[PDB]
Amino acid sequence: MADEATRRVVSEIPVLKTNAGPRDRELWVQRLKEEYQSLIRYVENNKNADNDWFRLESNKEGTRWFGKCWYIHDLLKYEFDIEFDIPITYPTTAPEIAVPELDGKTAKMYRGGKICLTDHFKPLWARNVPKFGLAHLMALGLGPWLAVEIPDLIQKGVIQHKE
């Protein structure tokens, strides 16, 4: 079940190849090309599915990422700023996405607004290293987190839509 669910979600996202993190020079440059190629294909697929739900940019070195995600609930669109640093031991270690506006607003999060994913995500990433990159982190991590947490917080009146 888990294998098929993963394949269904990521099958048209380009797979990554290079085992390199931020300190790895020419190999990191190559890994970043794979990350941008995989991200842009994922964005294009999302537009085609009427689900263009995020934008990301990075600093020059590709070690700090930041952007926006959108979530629709009862037809209202919510926007959240997101950010993350790339761990030195990336891509073996997954980055920790922060949604700073929601810091302290849900239990499924650490101090600083770092999202807390279920335990299934970590071994899933681990089993796939170095094939998964940032597109997969969005598709398999942030995406499903929002689909649980955002509805909950709206229902509890913690998140209100600005008019």
XYZ file of C-alpha atoms in Angstrom:
163
model
C 0.000 0.000 0.000
C 2.687 2.462 1.052
C 4.789 1.802 -2.070
C 1.871 2.356 -4.408
C 0.730 5.504 -2.547
C 4.248 6.901 -2.837
C 4.498 6.072 -6.555
C 1.056 7.596 -7.227
C 2.161 10.873 -5.665
C 5.654 11.186 -7.124
C 5.709 9.240 -10.451
C 6.018 12.315 -12.775
C 8.517 14.192 -10.582
C 12.069 13.821 -11.966
C 14.195 11.607 -9.750
C 17.452 13.017 -8.420
C 20.846 11.318 -8.613
C 23.745 13.088 -6.978
C 24.748 12.420 -3.383
C 25.968 15.881 -2.443
C 25.201 18.521 0.156
C 26.092 22.216 0.564
C 29.837 21.731 1.176
C 30.412 19.498 -1.877
C 31.507 22.050 -4.492
C 31.042 20.939 -8.120
C 28.885 18.014 -6.977
C 26.640 20.372 -5.005
C 26.286 22.565 -8.088
C 25.145 19.455 -9.996
C 22.756 18.417 -7.219
C 21.231 21.893 -7.351
C 20.618 21.504 -11.109
C 18.777 18.297 -10.389
C 16.773 20.036 -7.601
C 15.697 22.920 -9.837
C 14.850 20.588 -12.735
C 12.739 18.390 -10.442
C 11.058 21.390 -8.799
C 10.136 23.080 -12.050
C 8.651 19.935 -13.539
C 6.629 19.458 -10.341
C 5.390 23.078 -10.560
C 4.401 22.573 -14.225
C 2.538 19.371 -13.355
C 0.798 21.255 -10.519
C -0.343 24.021 -12.852
C -1.761 21.389 -15.214
C -3.655 19.843 -12.319
C -5.079 23.216 -11.145
C -3.010 22.795 -7.954
C -0.247 25.385 -8.249
C 0.254 25.449 -4.521
C 3.766 26.801 -3.864
C 6.722 28.897 -5.001
C 10.286 28.599 -3.737
C 13.491 30.466 -4.267
C 16.944 29.912 -2.833
C 19.950 32.017 -1.968
C 22.889 32.035 -4.445
C 24.491 28.930 -2.858
C 21.176 27.011 -2.704
C 21.546 26.471 1.071
C 18.641 28.577 2.251
C 15.185 28.247 0.673
C 12.113 30.409 1.123
C 8.810 30.974 -0.536
C 5.087 30.685 -0.177
C 2.497 27.970 -0.145
C -1.235 28.331 -0.668
C -3.993 26.165 0.704
C -7.647 26.270 -0.392
C -10.382 25.511 2.123
C -14.091 26.006 1.361
C -12.919 27.931 -1.727
C -10.951 30.521 0.299
C -7.221 30.655 -0.428
C -4.747 30.906 2.446
C -1.127 31.953 1.993
C 1.782 30.968 4.274
C 5.456 31.934 4.166
C 7.732 28.912 4.364
C 11.493 28.570 4.776
C 14.192 25.992 5.362
C 17.924 25.437 5.507
C 19.655 22.593 3.707
C 21.369 20.275 6.292
C 25.083 19.645 5.799
C 24.270 15.942 5.400
C 21.587 16.498 2.772
C 20.275 14.617 0.792
C 20.508 11.747 3.287
C 18.911 13.973 5.915
C 15.704 15.786 5.004
C 15.377 19.574 5.462
C 13.066 20.855 8.212
C 10.388 23.101 6.735
C 9.296 25.986 8.904
C 6.025 27.877 8.581
C 6.946 30.727 10.938
C 3.486 32.400 11.018
C 2.102 29.243 12.602
C 4.787 28.947 15.327
C 3.005 27.807 18.517
C -0.373 27.499 16.787
C -0.498 23.711 16.243
C 0.804 20.773 18.313
C 2.136 19.133 15.121
C 5.119 21.436 15.031
C 8.345 22.195 16.914
C 9.453 25.554 18.384
C 10.223 28.003 15.578
C 7.423 26.716 13.391
C 9.257 23.632 12.105
C 6.534 21.232 10.938
C 6.282 17.826 12.550
C 5.626 15.062 10.047
C 4.417 11.538 10.907
C 7.015 8.844 11.577
C 6.330 7.222 8.167
C 7.965 10.108 6.301
C 11.460 9.676 7.710
C 12.022 6.009 6.816
C 10.346 6.678 3.452
C 12.887 9.396 2.706
C 15.717 7.232 4.073
C 14.801 4.261 1.849
C 14.866 6.486 -1.212
C 18.140 8.464 -0.669
C 19.420 10.160 -2.863
C 16.468 9.914 -5.250
C 14.159 12.313 -3.396
C 14.769 16.039 -3.342
C 12.936 19.231 -2.476
C 10.008 18.522 -4.879
C 9.407 15.240 -3.024
C 9.694 16.970 0.369
C 6.929 19.320 -0.763
C 4.777 16.580 -2.363
C 5.157 13.991 0.398
C 5.813 16.153 3.454
C 4.427 19.678 3.436
C 1.472 18.939 1.154
C -0.184 16.270 3.371
C 0.725 18.231 6.512
C -1.236 21.247 5.262
C -4.186 19.004 4.282
C -4.547 18.026 7.954
C -3.328 21.062 9.909
C -4.814 23.931 7.917
C -8.440 22.639 8.035
C -8.023 21.953 11.775
C -6.720 25.439 12.532
C -9.460 27.086 10.454
C -12.120 25.047 12.284
C -10.630 26.066 15.666
C -10.577 29.720 14.593
C -6.779 29.877 14.957
C -6.351 30.808 11.262
C -8.708 33.443 9.920
C -8.945 34.497 6.299
C -8.123 38.163 5.626
C -10.920 39.890 3.714
